[PDB]
Amino acid sequence: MSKLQQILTYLESEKLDVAVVSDPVTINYLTGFYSDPHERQMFLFVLADQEPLLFVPALEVERASSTVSFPVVGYVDSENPWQKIKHALPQLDFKRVAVEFDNLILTKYHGLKTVFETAEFDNLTPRIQRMRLIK
Amino acid sequence: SNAMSKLQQILTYLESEKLDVAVVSDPVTINYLTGFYSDPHERQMFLFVLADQEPLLFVPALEVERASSTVSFPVVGYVDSENPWQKIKHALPQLDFKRVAVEFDNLILTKYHGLKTVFETAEFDNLTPRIQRMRLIK
Amino acid sequence: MSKLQQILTYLESEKLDVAVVSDPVTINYLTGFYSDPHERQMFLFVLADQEPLLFVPALEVERASSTVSFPVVGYVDSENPWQKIKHALPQLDFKRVAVEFDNLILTKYHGLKTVFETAEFDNLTPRIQRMRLIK
Amino acid sequence: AMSKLQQILTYLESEKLDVAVVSDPVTINYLTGFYSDPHERQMFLFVLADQEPLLFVPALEVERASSTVSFPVVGYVDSENPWQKIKHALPQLDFKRVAVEFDNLILTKYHGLKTVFETAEFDNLTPRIQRMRLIK
């Protein structure tokens, strides 16, 4: 059972529509792709029903696509990343989203609130901390 | 964690050494990089880590099911009546392979001459020291 | 590692052919040369494999030349500055250029698109903001 | 105001050395302005007594080295034996006395160089370079 597969079972039990992973250390733990995007946006979206989506700066798309097997979407500096995420994700009613409270900065939290306009936000961090206990 | 994965470290290495692909032939190294272990005895098995797309694991037909549930990137198998070199060449992207790395401490001459039909005009560099370096981060 | 050197390292990591600095405050930060050109064109070009080029109005060439040690090119009002910049720079295939998104106005951006006709344009501002964190 | 490489030549004369072998990439870059980390591959700068130096590098570095320095660069690929290639690239002299950097040269490379200079005695080059760094 993949780590990503365990996230899926978690979404099913907590009635989450998506988990949004923002910390490059957690992204690498779950997918095997590591990058430090500095000021640019990068997120992994684990969605309840379909394949995940890794969203990265355009300069990382080829390396990320070679590293993972599910879809990767990039954005260049002149594109607006929040709109690009919103169009790349499935067009669902996202009522409940989990994010990493111990990593997510407020600039990103406000940006995700333009993607998920009426969601409540739960904390994903303790679930990933519990997952690391089992090697 | 903050440790670069082994596959991504080989991708990074392919770019800085200007390599088009690394060919891993040692079942021990393949298991180290992917967690898939098989002793193919006389049959062909290679992991091809390509510079710019996901890797290809190539195995005897009997290992395809176990290999495909172990790794998430493509697995191609071959049966005894198929010629493995032609099958690898058709399964790989049709690129111009100018530079290839292989494990000098493992690859026997019959496999080296087989890979020379797959990569007909490549130079061959040695991948072994890079993988020995990778094991120094434990 | 001088500031211009740090920009050089940055250009290699981000696969940029040149960084174009347009803000007089940033150019003074990087070089020690301060001028307000008003409506006239001034740019510092940091190139990946040679020394930088400071491009200024003709009246500033003397003071610029005696403030920095790399090449300074001037232009007078009757010269077209876009053409003169294009001739003064090396004759490379500029594929990727970085410019300061927070400073660069659209009339300058359009003229730089005449200098670099097929480049894609990345944002240099966050890199310079990161650099100022370290005294 | 003689160049660093010229100071090495004077040194080989006063010490009765046939050649100074520089193995530390930081020292090679100090003397020539060429920096490369070769990891496990061989790279040496050979400062010869009567003759221009020879920079020996992995094949991938030959182009960048060749445009950094103006004396001869020789590369080797992974399937060539670097010790045989060095020995054929150097002048066919009787190397009786050779200097190497005691503080950098690992035993694998010392044994390799002993195939190249089969009857030399080896002196320590490191203190001489440390003395050169004292002068701006």
Question: What's a quick, concise take on this entry?
Answer:
It is classed as hydrolase. The structure is a homotetramer. Chain A is built from six helices and six strands; from the N terminus they run H-E-H-E-E-H-E-H-E-H-E-H.
Q: What portion of residues of chain A belong to β-strands?
A: 15-25%
Helical content of chain A stands at 25-40%
Pair with the biggest interface: A-B, 14 and 16 residues
* Morphology of chain A: globular
Order of helices and strands of chain A: HEHEEHEHEHEH
CATH topology label of chain A:
Creatine Amidinohydrolase, Chain A, domain 1
Q: If you had to describe this structure to a student in words, what would you say it looks like?
A:
The PDB classes it as hydrolase. Keywords: Structural Genomics, Protein Structure Initiative, Midwest Center for Structural Genomics, hydrolase. The assembly is tetrameric. The entry is titled "Crystal structure of a proline dipeptidase from streptococcus pneumoniae tigr4". The structure is a homotetramer. The first copy, chain A, has helices spanning 3-14, 24-31, 61-67, 81-88, 106-115, 125-132; strands at 18-21, 43-47, 53-57, 72-75, 96-99, 120-123. Chain A is an alpha/beta fold and 135 residues long. Chain A has one domain (2-135): Creatine Amidinohydrolase, Chain A, domain 1 (3-Layer(aba) Sandwich), CATH 3.40.350.10. A six-stranded mixed beta sheet of chain A has the order 4-3-2-1-5-6, with helices on both faces. The first copy, chain A, starts with a helix and ends with a helix. The A-B interface holds A 2, 25, 28-29, 32-34, 62-63, 65-69 and B 1-5, 7-8, 11-12, 50-54, 72-73.
